[PDB]
Point group: C3
């Protein structure tokens, strides 16, 4: 099966600059090279080039709506394309607002996909409930069907179509949820596992329930939108919104290990890696590497080790 | 339901100065303000003022017995009072020796309460088994019934009455127990979960067994005496007795989260926070904040998030 | 029951110098003294003195084969001796290649022993599958029966006899396995718990299955070969091969605590501690201490605490 790396050097989803340098560091850490060494065909599509919408006025509170709507429009197109040709799309990137485009382009080719969202935040704020207007905290809002027409239309997102419902998404890692965001997820009966659940249940049982809940009836494609801040700040210190008491490095690998085993991985999001937010070179390296490592886990790399088929090492 | 903050800036329970500055930093970190934002009525009773017993000679090994006996006498009175009026008493404080007074005053108004003691130490040394004489490591000894008249009477604790028995107390976090202390807890068949049990069982199952063991028959009030050193030194570095390999920040929040859900929280002890023991400002801040956070957990604040009832955020 | 400390300051098992300074630091940290304080008879046999084989040419890729074969030959003899007299042998040491000698000498006196191997690596590379030739990564290869005559004879290991089979060994901590190594352990149906299993199952259940799998039928002696790098780099930072996402300080104590309770501990290996690889004095101290602590756990020291029998502390 083929794999395609898509860089999405974008950062207008949030105020802190640096995330556009994300895909660049992930590659610099040998994400491709390493990937090639697995049982998958790798092809680097390069980093999409975004054209900055001049005079992008803030739609009420929502900031840079047109720049983000155009950036995501462009990507969704590219993702749909590689999905079309039967390959797995892997989106390295800047902020998490690019998930709007990634999950959209994916949904087109596979309208029956479900989403496993590993993040410390829900990112389900509507243009009406954000307190910052930063779009990187509203992706789920544009993609959900139930949240359709529950908020005014935004400059540039016209092209979007609420493709997935609240019964096809699952959260794992939540620990910092806004009042409104909590309202929406309790209102729409969305399935999730907050750090407290992860604590009570254990990561093993979490993944167990997440699959039987999303693949119970029909076995559909899986889109893994992984927000690097879903691990405790200790492991992935270089991000915009660190939040203590989160997933651990082991837990994050186990979650990507189990998803691999389901053989249903169709799309991936290695979002929020910001090479400029590390208090020391170490931290940034720590962060870029676990991101890399998490990605390789999604595509084979097992901790127990791996060996090439049909080869007798003795 | 009402809540009442009672500062007890005392520190003669142990040699290291600084803990009396405890309640002051907890408030400085917005403990009240934040508390108010929950579904509870908050009322700051202020910091009790302790009068130093002059010429307080050491009763054999036990040090500052009269100062501690008088400090705890004063508090017990105050705690009983707010307990009397039907409010939850929250004791911020200096050393853990003030637990003698807190649990006493509480016991009066509710003689059927049980105690969940999150600490790395047992603090069940009798004036006869301490090796330091520091009283902050003997609280349980004065409160237990079975340990009645098993040690000589001390200058100033006359007013105390062994109110609870060893079948109403539960330990969670133990990892540094003296020879004698271990003897006593094995002798009196006291229930506890040492870091090893927490390791074997998982925090989820720990809490499960702790409740069915203390609320199995009758559902009684719960007194949570939380010694901040019960978390690993990494999370709460500013204390008198750091001990590695302890509870983690997540575990600590889960323990306070579950206790909240039992709806039986009557008294709380946020003991041992020492603003002057942090190797760097960071450490102190780290410590004061998790202490704060643990307290808010006890009264509502959930990681999955919260929203105000009867309010339609859409 | 008696205990005997045997230093094996050897380091030709791997390229990085420093490990021969291992036993010296472990003792410098009071390993003996502390040990004495337990219910065991302690006797320091001192550090074996190894004679360097001059002109030790590399057998193909395998390096320093004669120096290592002679070093291990010497030790096996000493270990068999103290095992003979009915005492427990504790081998402090340099690299893990010395396990060949330790487990051999042990097997002689107790041919029915099983091995619990706490390590991040399998160390089951045959002189034919190593990529470095470093012997500290091939111990199991020489000791296994099934791997008999599957590789050419090496200069100096003639004296060895594949004494244990793949159904008497168990791995716990694996997270960095070579392709070949993985092949061998899957081929020989060897039992193990990789960090992923530890994650899914929990350490408690791990130990549970490890015992019922090795002591299910017959209750035999246990040889614990503990590779200090089996803990995450955070706790034992001073080693040759750090690997992230490994066992935690608590987990490591639990594993040694449970093995103690089985009352079957016959031999111990406190391998790989390298006092010269610590980025700061702290790290080395951190490392030497947990090593020490893990050892004391094997012989009694419980976290819940200990008290001397027949002594009424009241
Ligand atoms: N509540 C915050 C959410 S911050 C979004 C964090 S993320 N996961 O990087 O998208 C907001 O007001 O935007
Ligand atoms: N074993 C020690 C116990 S130190 C008490 C620690 S605490 N939890 O802060 O009260 C003593 O001799 O007092
Ligand atoms: N695959 C490595 C294994 S490194 C052995 C690590 S240890 N546990 O210290 O023996 C090799 O090529 O020797
Ligand atoms: Mn996000
Ligand atoms: Mn996030
Ligand atoms: Mn205490
Ligand atoms: Mn304590
Ligand atoms: Mn090893
Ligand atoms: Mn190793």
């Amino acid at each position: 099966k083929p794999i395609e790396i898509i860089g999405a050097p974008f950062s207008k989803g949030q105020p802190r600059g640096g995330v556009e340098k994300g895909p660049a560091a992930l590659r610099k850490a040998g994400l491709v090279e390493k990937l090639k060494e697995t049982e998958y065909n790798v092809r680097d599509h390069g980093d999409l080039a975004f054209v900055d919408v001049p005079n992008d006025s803030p739609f009420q509170i929502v900031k840079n709506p047109r720049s983000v709507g155009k950036a995501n429009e462009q990507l969704a197109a590219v993702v749909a394309e590689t999905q079309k040709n039967g390959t797995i799309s892997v989106v390295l990137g800047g902020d998490h607002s690019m998930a709007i485009g990634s999950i959209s382009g994916h949904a087109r080719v596979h309208p029956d996909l479900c989403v496993i969202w590993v993040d410390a935040h829900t990112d389900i704020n509507t243009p009406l409930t954000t307190s910052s207007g930063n779009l990187h905290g509203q992706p789920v809002a544009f993609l959900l069907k139930e949240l359709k027409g529950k908020f005014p239309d935004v400059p540039g997102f016209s092209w979007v179509t609420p493709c997935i419902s609240a019964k096809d998404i699952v959260y794992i890692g939540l620990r910092d949820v806004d009042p409104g965001e909590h309202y929406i997820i309790k209102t729409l009966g969305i399935k999730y596992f907050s750090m407290t659940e992860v604590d009570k249940l254990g990561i093993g049982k979490v993944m167990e329930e997440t699959f039987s809940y999303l693949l119970g009836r029909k076995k559909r494609p899986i889109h893994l939108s992984f927000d690097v801040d879903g691990l405790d700040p200790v492991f992935t210190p270089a991000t915009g919104t660190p939040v203590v008491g989160g997933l651990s490095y082991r837990e994050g690998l186990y979650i990507t290990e189990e998803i691999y085993k389901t053989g249903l991985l169709s799309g991936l999001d290695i979002m929020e890696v910001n090479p400029t937010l590390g208090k020391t070179p170490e931290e940034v390296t720590r962060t870029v590497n676990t991101a890399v490592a998490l990605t390789l886990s999604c595509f084979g790399t097992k901790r127990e080790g791996n060996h090439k088929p049909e080869t007798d090492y003795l």
